């Protein structure tokens, strides 16, 4: 009786009311019920959003470049033809990626178990920065612009990145579903639908056609 | 030359057995077209069968009058030759894994003897404790020998006997 819910009239869960950004009381499988699993899942969803947004942005920009005339492959089968004629071998690229990501994902991990553990100044004497402002929102060094030093603006600005990330990760499932059917770029599926709405789904393989 | 056995490449019976197996495979391989699935399955089977017979004959493993391989299990005959892998290192690998397992299980069952109603912990395990101990036992030879010199594994004759 204080916030919009996902199902109008249903009783919101008793383990989440208004503290988390993007809270609508949607949890039917009783997940993140304990404080620790919720502290885990919050930052898990946050990282999912922060990767889905970058992925969808890159995909859409490369697709618009390809449709406009740029030398850009589509989002699918792009790691196959960018590796054939590249100076950096596969494997030597994968383990470079994993070596650079382990060192940062580990520091991201142990700031979840004990916040502020990274701001002791052992890494290049960085003390003020590298200190977890909240569960999954660090600051100081990752926030060069003073755009989170006000709760009135921050509680309202963080409640929209979760929505944009949820929408972006729903769009990423659209990218996959929208490829196994048409085998065309995501921007191509758009222009083939605005120019003629009659070319809507349920026309190629969405529904079974034995008759 | 040991035990009257001969290296397994010079065994006419071994090659005769390989040819027999290949003929038996091909006689029913010729039943299907080269495009269907069963044909590819038989092709891959023949692939790894030829691979069986080729890869064995390296570094030396003795086959007898029957042409089949025969494992040498004596240390000393696996030495002075090249047979230390027949069964000499597998022994140490199993000893390592069995140690690992027993060490972890013992330290678990000991650390549970302190809390109230340990029987419950034997039907409702402590999954995180078991996972922790599972990723700490791969130094058990070090811990075992020095825990033996320690004396924390000998019970000072305080158990139930009848005689």
């Amino acid at each position: 009786a204080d916030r919009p819910l996902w199902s109008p009239g249903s009783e919101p869960p008793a383990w989440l009311d208004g503290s988390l950004a993007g809270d609508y009381g949607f949890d039917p499988l009783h997940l993140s019920e304990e404080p620790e699993m919720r502290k885990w899942m919050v930052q898990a969803e946050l990282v999912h959003c922060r990767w889905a947004m970058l992925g969808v942005a890159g995909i859409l920009f490369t697709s618009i470049g390809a449709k406009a005339g740029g030398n850009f492959p589509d989002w699918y089968d792009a790691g196959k033809e960018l590796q054939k004629n590249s100076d950096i071998p596969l494997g030597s690229l994968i383990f470079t990626e994993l070596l650079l990501f382990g060192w940062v994902e580990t520091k991201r991990l142990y700031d979840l178990r004990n916040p502020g553990s990274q701001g002791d100044g052992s890494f290049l004497g960085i003390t003020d920065g590298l200190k977890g402002k909240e569960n999954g929102y660090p600051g100081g060094l990752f926030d060069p612009m003073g755009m989170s030093k006000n709760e009135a603006s921050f509680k309202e600005a963080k409640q929209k990145e979760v929505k944009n990330g949820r929408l972006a990760m729903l769009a990423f499932v659209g990218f996959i579903a929208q490829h196994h059917a048409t085998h065309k770029s995501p921007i191509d599926n758009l222009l083939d639908h605005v120019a003629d709405p009659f070319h809507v789904t349920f026309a190629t393989n969405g529904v079974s056609i034995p008759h | 030359d040991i035990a009257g056995l001969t290296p397994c490449s010079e065994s006419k019976a071994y090659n005769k057995l390989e040819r027999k197996e290949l003929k038996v495979l091909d006689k029913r391989l010729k039943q299907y077209e080269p495009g269907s699935a069963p044909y590819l399955a038989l092709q891959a089977t023949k692939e790894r069968t030829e691979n069986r017979f080729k890869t064995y004959a390296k570094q030396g493993l003795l086959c007898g009058n029957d042409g089949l391989p025969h494992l040498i299990s004596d240390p000393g005959l696996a030495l002075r030759f090249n047979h230390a892998g027949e069964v000499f290192i597998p022994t140490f690998g199993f000893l390592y894994v069995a140690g690992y397992i027993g060490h972890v299980g013992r330290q678990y069952i000991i650390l549970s003897k302190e809390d109230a109603k340990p029987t419950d912990k034997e039907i409702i395990l402590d999954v995180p404790l078991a996972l922790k101990l599972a990723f700490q036992g791969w130094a058990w030879p070090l811990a075992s020998i020095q825990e033996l010199r320690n004396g924390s594994l000998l019970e000072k004759d305080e158990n139930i006997t009848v005689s």
Partner: protein
């Protein structure tokens, strides 16, 4: 959720999770590595 995680310490867990891990590991080792009967050296 809590009672479910507690239930997940019995026969329907390791003893299933275990021995499923082990069957999978052994089958994968015998699949990628087709037919071992002696060590490399």
């Amino acid at each position: 959720m809590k009672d479910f995680t507690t239930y997940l310490s019995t026969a329907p867990v390791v003893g299933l999770g275990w021995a499923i891990f082990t069957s999978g590991l052994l089958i994968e080792i015998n699949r990628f590595f087709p037919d071992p009967l002696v060590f490399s050296f």
